[model samples]
Target: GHPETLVKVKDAEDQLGARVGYIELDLNSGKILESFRPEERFPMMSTFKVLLCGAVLSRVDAGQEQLGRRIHYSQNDLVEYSPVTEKHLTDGMTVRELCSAAITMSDNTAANLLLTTIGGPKELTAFLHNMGDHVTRLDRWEPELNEAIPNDERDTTTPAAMATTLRKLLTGELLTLASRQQLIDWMEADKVAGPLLRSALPAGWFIADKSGAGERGSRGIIAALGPDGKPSRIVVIYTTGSQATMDERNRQIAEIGASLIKHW
Candidate 1:
């Protein structure tokens, strides 16, 4: 693909914000295809779910946890910024549902509950270490994460670290093949951030990914960015303090995603 195609994506981002950063990977050979300010760490928002899922599954494999285990979501745990899962809570869900909700919908209720059960921020990062995501820093809690920490000091990650985790997962460093598949299943119907990545790809192209947005008016999407089983392109993009409205931001992200595909 021409470098201009990538630049165009960056240019489009400039219209929305004074600061935009992206890091891309070619999954086939495991090379970073493109990047701008990739080393700069940014708040990960709900993308922390990726690490959480990895942690929980590690617990499962250690026999410290069970996939079929059930957990309840309570009304008292709700937060305004989180996706509403109260409707689904009439009947509690399994460990799987909690994992699903945390990533698919970015639900704080489920994330909050899981954080509490699994030893909170310190423990979560400890698990990431076991998984080989050395740069991942899960520094806060939710539900109470809201009350416990300043908005600026919450979870933090760089595109480099996020890409590294995805690479590790693809290479089977994160979970057993079956457990990884289960995690992918939860990510497939992901309700949030889908429009930026999956919206541009053909059906059945096989993408596995996650996304995050921060309170500092920043958002990001990480994608497997390929067709068939191997994707040479890993798109991890972050935009911060964009003056654009919601519709504009989505359009900008979608446009960049589509452009990447067209050039692919």
Candidate 2:
């Protein structure tokens, strides 16, 4: 790792006036390239949806559920901040479609629907623990998550934990090859979260990632594979209490992402 890496990250955090945490893993060398408070917890927001998907997929892999299963959406399932609600209707959608929206669109309704399908937050946290990720746990569903819920009641994760879990997923330690590919394909098709890590990479690069934002700030976790689709690196960053505007925060994230890419 370059000595200047920490200096640059600290400078960026100082300029943004934010409490920032970051972790980068070099998959090729099995080394952590750089980190900043990687163990500090931060609100995960939509980023936890990825783990939700993993939990749900585990059920499918165990023959407890099916990908083709139908997940109906009544008016009760509708929630704000959901692209799925805007695009689809209270009518219905498939399990696969719900999972896709949960990742690609970060659809709140879709996440809750899957959460309900998987027996809610308790089951999801248990699944995460089973996967050896001890730093992430969910306490509420998407409705409370999108509301003014207290920080302690929402989902939270540390950079090291999130990135390492992502590493496990990408390395096929957590899911079957087909299921892992399905998850990655959904993430690669992401229509949101482009402003942070994704924006820093060149076109045609294969990246599977999930990004989250809140009233205080934004966060992102990405497993970026090069154009050839081989796992190259993992990055997780969480920021909070940013005095900078959303645009400035995003710019800071992009700049830091570019710096990491250059080193990679």
Candidate 3:
């Protein structure tokens, strides 16, 4: 690894007034290519939706749940930033559709609804535990999980754990073939992370990711990057404890993405 990698991570922390946790891995071999504070916990924010949906799909593959089942939620169930769910309140959406809304658009209501289907936050965390993951945990529901309070470990996951598990779900046999493809397709359709990280990458490079934003300028992105039609790199960047605006914090992730792209 180049010495400049550490320098860039430090620079992002300095500029954002936050702690940055990051990691990049070779998607094929699952080897760590670069990392900083990879073991440190950071509030997952909407990034947890990735794992939440993964858990739901696992149940589907196990014949315990049906992704095609329609889930109806009352208007009172809506949380802020639930564009897709708010629009479909009356008709309801399938388990598959709810997963898409949560992962692609970071719909808080969609996440909460899906979380309910699997029992709750603890159940999702249990799913991770069953997958041999000990570092990712969900202690609360959406909106509340985005608190970003300093030194609190309520709803957090280490960059290392998040990246590794994501790789397993998206590429490894941890998920059924069709389930794996569904997860990848949703990440590829992500509307938020690409706007922040993709533009910072080289032309023709592809990005599939999910992003998070919360109080105290907390922000993060977990992505798979490579040439178009190919996804080979897993990049996870997270920040917490910043006094800056969420926009500024996001810029920090973009800056880090650019640095990684330049080096790799």
Candidate 4:
């Protein structure tokens, strides 16, 4: 059985009034420590951007794309809620810059650029399936995601799929060694999406993570590595049907993070 803290984790989620999906994997031993509704599909929100990043980097590793290549963006790619590309809509961006901004700032315009350049939503889904993730899929681009009606599922993924994809990346099953490290580097330098796992990690532990949230709910997964650069933990947390305020949701996430930290 998982540690007793998971019982407390469940109790906290119940009090938070959010439908919670969680998974914690021991990356070094391939052990699934604890899980709750890990296979249930939930709207991915901005979390899908991590898959987009992997797909683009896969092409670059295959020599079909260049990270340094510059790409132009028109007003069409411009979307609100993106601080990084809000001003660059009239200008252009490079592939490397877009990848960084997409993860660091969760920039919609940057994600659109990378998604468009790497074919489309179909290609991203294909990349996931090809890399052994069956439960994560992209159905629409960034702009179309805005048009999703309530009760309509946007991009969806399972907690298991998200954690496994990150595991594959770190183990070099998805991207090349250099590309894998690059992706990790991008996530390590992340300036956004840290209200959960990263913010609550124990001292001497470092985490590379991507997080997503919206009116529907919030989701995040972090890869925690020890000071020796060895795998320590993998945690995926998703909440849906959450009527709580953002502050409450964030605090709940941090609480769950503490449980996982204790288990670690």
Clashes of each: 5, 0, 0, 0
lDDT of 3: 0.89
Which ranges of candidate 4 are over 4 A from the true structure?
143-154, 227-230
lDDT digits (tens) for residues 1-264 of candidate 2: 685656667977899877788888876455787899888777787888888888878788899989888766666667878877556665478889989988998898999889988888988888888888877888888756533233563577888888888777666466888888888788778888778877887776667778777756555455555556555777888787665787787777788878777766
Give the winner by lDDT: 2 or 3.
3
**Per-prediction TM-score to the true structure, in the order listed:** 0.87, 0.91, 0.97, 0.91
Cα lDDT over the full model 2: 0.77
Estimate the overall C-alpha local distance difference test score of candidate 4: 0.75
How should the candidates be ordered by lDDT, best one leading? Answer: 3, 2, 4, 1
**Candidate 3 C-alpha lDDT tens digits along 84-155:** 999997899999999999999999999999999999999999999998899898999878999988888889
Instruction: Report the error of model 3 at residue 227, Å.
Output: 2.2
RMSD, each candidate, Å?
3.0, 2.2, 1.2, 2.2
Top-scoring candidate (lDDT): 3
Better of 1 and 3 by lDDT: 3
lDDT against the true structure, per candidate, is 0.71, 0.77, 0.89, 0.75
Quote model 3's TM-score. 0.97
RMSD of 3: 1.2
Candidate 2 versus the native: TM-score? 0.91
Clashing pairs in 2: none
Give the true-structure RMSD of model 2. Answer: 2.2
Return whichever of 3 and 4 wins on lDDT.
3
For 194-222, candidate 4 gives per-residue lDDT tens digits of 67776777667777777777555554455
Off by over 4 Å in 1: 81-84, 88-90, 143-153, 229-232
